[PDB]
Design an enzyme around this catalytic site. Structure first.
Site, PDB file in Angstrom:
ATOM      1  N   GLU B 286      75.168 -11.921 -39.100  1.00  0.00           N
ATOM      2  CA  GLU B 286      74.411 -12.390 -37.974  1.00  0.00           C
ATOM      3  C   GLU B 286      75.406 -12.612 -36.847  1.00  0.00           C
ATOM      4  O   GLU B 286      76.340 -13.399 -36.946  1.00  0.00           O
ATOM      5  CB  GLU B 286      73.567 -13.620 -38.356  1.00  0.00           C
ATOM      6  CG  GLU B 286      73.683 -14.856 -37.474  1.00  0.00           C
ATOM      7  CD  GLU B 286      72.798 -14.870 -36.247  1.00  0.00           C
ATOM      8  OE1 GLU B 286      72.423 -13.790 -35.743  1.00  0.00           O
ATOM      9  OE2 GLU B 286      72.489 -15.996 -35.784  1.00  0.00           O
ATOM     10  N   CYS B 320      73.548 -18.662 -30.591  1.00  0.00           N
ATOM     11  CA  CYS B 320      73.183 -17.239 -30.656  1.00  0.00           C
ATOM     12  C   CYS B 320      71.770 -16.938 -30.132  1.00  0.00           C
ATOM     13  O   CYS B 320      71.501 -15.812 -29.684  1.00  0.00           O
ATOM     14  CB  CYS B 320      73.374 -16.700 -32.078  1.00  0.00           C
ATOM     15  SG  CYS B 320      75.133 -16.618 -32.593  1.00  0.00           S
TER      16      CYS B 320
END
Lengths: 516, 516
Positions: B286, B320
């Site tokens: 990720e 993020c």
């Protein structure tokens, strides 16, 4: 208006008079069609090159099955661009319609079943039984993945707290590069092409250069079942020019590979590189080799043991990633299982597979012929030759079923994939030692245990580290939806084809959340 | 047997008894600052002379903790420890593995505000963010324990008469968990215990800016009853340890959360089969996002103002999932801009131990320096509306910064800043706003603020992000409700806190017993 539940396509019983007659008619049909020319298929257009790939009968090395056009880098580029263009609309075609095209394709193959089998007989050198099984399996992949996509289109239930609506579902990814094998020239080529197709991806297909004609036959079927242009693209060619170019392209989203370890590792390593202009990490499904083992316990049915070894070792002349090329037997029972297997092996028929009474056909080509024979020479030194060990390439690529005995578990022929009709016997002290030897390869694809001990069955379920583990039968012949196929270690990514997890590997999960 | 999953409630800080409880936890943690923390290898505490020091980002000279530092030998020792632990942990009943997660969740739930206070001091998190991080760690433990119990049933596959076929999941091996600083508790917990509950063992290399809270969580796992070597706490530099862990031939799985430049290099290096390596390494990554909140002509502009503010400045944009781009319909651009500027000027910035501070500092000098440079680029790209000022003197404080009228292709509209910065851009219409939305190399989160139903359904299809939200902020996903992961350079779309997550940490096995 719902599809009837999936069930496997029955194997053809060639003891029924009308089935043989029908199969012989299909063999005549294909024989008359031998020697034809096949174009590349790019965006629905037929593209002929004057540079060609000649495909030869392995049982008759001077018989041309067909000659296909050969792609180059520039046509590979066009093939990718066609796939990318078609994807813009293909990703939005209703999943029910996508599945219907697979269902229509299955019905065309089902209607023309023996013709597809007789193509495999001629081009891959498959015996009647193996050819039929292959065609049945392609039919299954179509019917199975059609149903799976409709199931997957439902998405998955997640939680929503009061005042919000949360949904989890799957989305198409992009251009898929399918690189298929020759040993399952129809079945695996079909599965690894249609799984991406039905999940709304598009495909650039590079079939094995040793079996490209049956793949051209299948792409024709896809067109007849109503698949839009560019959704599949048919581009056989060299690994150096086309293979490497397709994997490296920045627009390739997904790669699905089935073949040898050495090509696979290099493919897997190259695919991971983020190239210039590449906005994603590529997803890679690899199915590489096996060095599979049949373990036989001291309480085994010894006849069943010998029969399961025979079929595992010599079915399609050992040209299977699932082949039982190793037989590891309990000490109390080794000499006797070895004699029962030798006794079966030397009465097996080897010849032209158009002849029904031949159990084994030839190996694929001269390169494989020589590789197998060179392993047999190595084997003869490392062990005790029991039967076979002879080859004759004068008409076709014929190798006798070969059994070598008393091998050390570290031997070259205990470790390396031969992909020929050779099984190596190995003595085990007890059951614990038998699984230790069984696990001592760099692969983890298939294996079998022959035992009447439940504790030993449960022990191997935990300790025998293969992706497909079978009890009291052969370690070959996985059925779509019954025995999902793939394995560990240097066998690849354990992407269980013909299983319930397979379609989701080809898609990206998406989460949408509306707050009210 | 276990009660159905629901998320851990967030703490209501308007209730005085909650404030009082939280203030006492801050006092407790403040007394414990500047302690020494060894590496944990196979249960043993290892002190080194080399030290990684963890400093408070709000008070830069305050020593939160000093941790021991691994070298290659100690990295080697940790992989070996994890490998030997795996030999038995692979065989621990899934229910018992799951129950250890539950006990660990209970420990954190009982010490909830203590764990949150560790986040305030070490990562500079405001009370709300620290609390939500802690609740998410609890959630991962509860959700993944239950997901494992369900996964241990396997999946239904077909059996023809005379056989019994099963499809179930097996543990893989040693896992390298490389965890981020920005959810120093939550994501570190998720990506450590997902491999653990699936029967794998872990070498954990936490982010060197936040290693203290990771040392604390390893102690929780020990207290909950985790056997030695199943987790190994091994902070260190990327060069000596991080690359060595990734490249090790015994490493089977790698879970990474962090930036694109680091995640890409890891992905490419992980794919190569090193000497003595018998498998292909599975990798979950990720990486970042360049997320966008899209505001339609039809929108509640107060809601749109709030949503942008929270997306942009939640944890000073160090996420993020951070809405660092705001793309507004032309008809409403001025009005949303002025409303967002009027909320941003009211945001209190300072020491996060103080409840009255909504925003805290950024993590270190490096992060401070990079964001300010991006602010300097931004000033030459468009119109500075508010903030843009930074102060390094006591901690690393940056003002909530708005820059407007950006070219959709501008640097601050493409590159991840990871800071309290939003770029505003004017879109001609809804279709053009989706075009600007989809124009980065990332695919993590986005939001659409609109009262048009058709535009919502069109967004569900054409807004290409893994996590898509309507009429709210694009941050703050909840485990089991908003499974988290994305497309393109955001990574592998391995949906954390979702139903597919645990199977990615396991390899499927097919087992088949033939009866007659």
């Amino acid at each position: 208006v719902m599809l009837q539940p999936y069930k496997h396509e029955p194997f053809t019983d060639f003891t029924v008079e009308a089935n043989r007659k029908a199969f012989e008619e299909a063999l005549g049909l294909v024989e008359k069609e031998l020697g034809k020319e096949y174009p590349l298929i790019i965006n629905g257009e037929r593209v002929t090159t004057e540079d060609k790939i000649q495909s030869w009968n392995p049982a008759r090395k001077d018989q041309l099955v067909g000659s296909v056009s050969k792609a180059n880098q520039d046509l590979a580029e066009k093939a990718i661009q066609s796939a990318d263009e078609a994807f813009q609309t293909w990703r939005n075609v209703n999943p029910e319609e996508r599945a219907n095209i697979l269902v229509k394709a299955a019905a065309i193959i089902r209607r023309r079943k023996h013709e597809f089998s007789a193509w495999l007989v001629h081009e891959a050198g498959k015996p009647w039984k193996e050819a039929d099984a292959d065609t049945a399996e392609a039919i299954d992949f179509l019917e199975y993945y059609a149903r799976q996509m409709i199931e997957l289109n439902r998405g998955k239930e997640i939680l929503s707290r009061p005042g919000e609506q949360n949904r989890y579902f799957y989305t198409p990814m992009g251009v898929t590069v399918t690189i298929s094998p020759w040993n399952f020239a129809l079945a695996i080529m079909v599965g690894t092409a249609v799984a991406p197709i039905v999940t709304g991806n598009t495909v650039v297909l590079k079939p094995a250069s040793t079996t490209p004609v049956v793949a051209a036959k299948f792409v024709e079927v896809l067109e007849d079942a109503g698949l839009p242009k560019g959704v599949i693209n048919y581009v056989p060619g060299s690994g150096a020019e086309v293979g490497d170019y397709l994997v490296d392209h920045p627009k390739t989203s997904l790669i699905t590979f089935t073949g040898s370890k050495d090509v696979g590792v290099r493919l897997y390593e190259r695919a991971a590189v983020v190239r210039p202009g590449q906005n994603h990490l590529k997803r890679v499904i690899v199915e590489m080799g096996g060095k599979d083992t049949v373990v036989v316990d001291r309480d085994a049915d010894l006849d069943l043991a010998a029969e399961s070894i025979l079929v595992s070792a010599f079915g399609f002349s050992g040209q299977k990633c699932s082949a039982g090329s190793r037989a590891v037997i309990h000490k109390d029972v080794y000499d006797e299982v070895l004699e029962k297997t030798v006794a079966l092996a030397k009465n097996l028929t080897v010849g032209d597979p158009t002849n029904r009474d031949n159990y084994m056909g030839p190996v694929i080509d001269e390169k494989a012929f020589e590789k197998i024979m060179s392993y047999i020479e190595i084997g003869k030194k490392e062990g005790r030759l029991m039967t076979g060990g002879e080859g004759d390439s004068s008409t076709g690529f014929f190798i006798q079923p070969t059994i070598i005995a008393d091998l050390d578990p570290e031997a070259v022929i205990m470790q390396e994939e031969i992909f020929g009709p050779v099984v190596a016997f190995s003595k085990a002290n007890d059951f614990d030692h038998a699984l230790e030897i069984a696990n001592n390869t760099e692969y983890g694809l298939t294996g079998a245990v022959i035992t009447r001990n439940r504790a030993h069955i449960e022990q191997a379920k935990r300790e025998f580290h293969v992706g497909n583990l079978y009890f009291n039968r052969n370690c070959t012949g996985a059925i779509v939806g019954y025995h999902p196929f793939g394995g560990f270690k240097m066998s690849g990514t354990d992407s269980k084809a013909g299983g319930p997890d397979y379609l989701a590997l080809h898609m990206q999960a998406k989460t949408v959340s509306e707050m009210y």
